Amino acid sequence: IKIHTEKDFIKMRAAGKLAAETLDFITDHVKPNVTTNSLNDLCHNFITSHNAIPAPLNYKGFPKSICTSINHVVCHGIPNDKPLKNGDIVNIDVTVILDGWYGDTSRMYYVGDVAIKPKRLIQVTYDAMMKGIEVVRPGAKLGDIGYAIQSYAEKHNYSVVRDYTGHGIGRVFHDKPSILNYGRNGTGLTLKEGMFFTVEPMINAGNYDTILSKLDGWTVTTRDKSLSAQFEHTIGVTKDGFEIFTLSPKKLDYPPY
Template identity: 35%
Template sequence: MTITSEEDLARLKAIGRICAVARDTMAAALEPGITTQELDDIGRKVLEASGARSAPEITYQFPGATCISVNEEIAHGMPGDRVIAAGDLVNIDVSAEKDGVFADTGASYIVPPGRPRIEKLCRDGKKAMWAGIRAVRAGGGLADIGTAIGKFAGMHGYTLIRNLASHGVGDSLHDAPGEIPTWPDRSERRRIGDGLVFTIEPFLSLGGQMAEEKDLDDPWTLVSVPAAPCVQYEHTVVATKRGAVVVTLAA
């Protein structure tokens, strides 16, 4: 999607805020004993109350309104009977559609008490995302995003999952210009158009390099290879000549 009018921007901001509220409401409900299905039900209620629809459901027939990934899972976790426990690392990813416009956001959370090493990973995961967001500027290179994130990761001793990318969003869940690397990629030559809408979502890890399917019985859930803790933080942004406008903030 490319924003060409104030009406376009208003619709994008509306669905962006709905996704953010669902994400934050689910995060507030995280506690030992809650199941991932119960957490997903909370997110679904927020979406439905706002007149929005789950993007993975309507796009890919995903078996849940949101993606909830726990510990060894790093993305696309299916809601179910898994029980959240104290100390778990939980990623909540919410994408939805309203009035023909899609937005996407996600964040990782620790259910207290957390280990200091994982708490630091979460703090730095946010910083990696914001490093990428600060690199966004209309007319700049899409490669600038991955370069900035890669610089941050390298300086702090982290790895990046290199087959889970940012992506265009807006007219659909996965929109033009397609995948956008959130790691350094010298082959990336595309420029950022004014008004282009896309996600920034690095997967920062303590050793992980790639994502692969968890097992043959689960075609959705992804885990890190090699196995390692991993966090994801994600916002939907609009590129302008002054930088990025973030639309997936709750307030």
């Protein structure tokens, strides 16, 4: 696990800011009848016009510049030509590379008028992410992150996806260690100043089991077809706490926006 210094923190602040600015920008474009392919092109040109690279583009063959995951899609959805429908929920997940450093962040968006139950799932997911980030400091352990997220989700009768995790990040997209979204207090490796990683819980309204698309090699869905929501931030461990690199500059942290 790589230990970074202040010079690298400066670089990660800039990459994370741009990733978060991409998500602020896309907000007003998420409407009924818009396709995820349209949203991908909007984000692509925003990213590149800011002197940066969309990390997902051809990453392990991924065919688009962002991930867009609708309703029972858990993560890694591929932008396509289907119109978004009133009542849908969508995760938009952006990663930019700026001067060689990766900024990774996602948020949930409402499409038109959304029902009470999807809105509850979204809110719980955001809150759970923040419970996880909030334990981070040198001497805390990875399992403390997972316990905080899992406890918060499960107290609301939701489940935590096990098969996909957060990750180290910096000059690499996906580095050590794996940041599990479930766990037990006081277990796992010890956090240290200078570590960078993501916190990206996926929370299901039903059971935690997921399925990977046999057809596109990427799209993950809930096995029970229940709704799933996700938020993500890129963070760093400081001398006595954490720093989030991907905060929305416009304070568009969670919907409604």
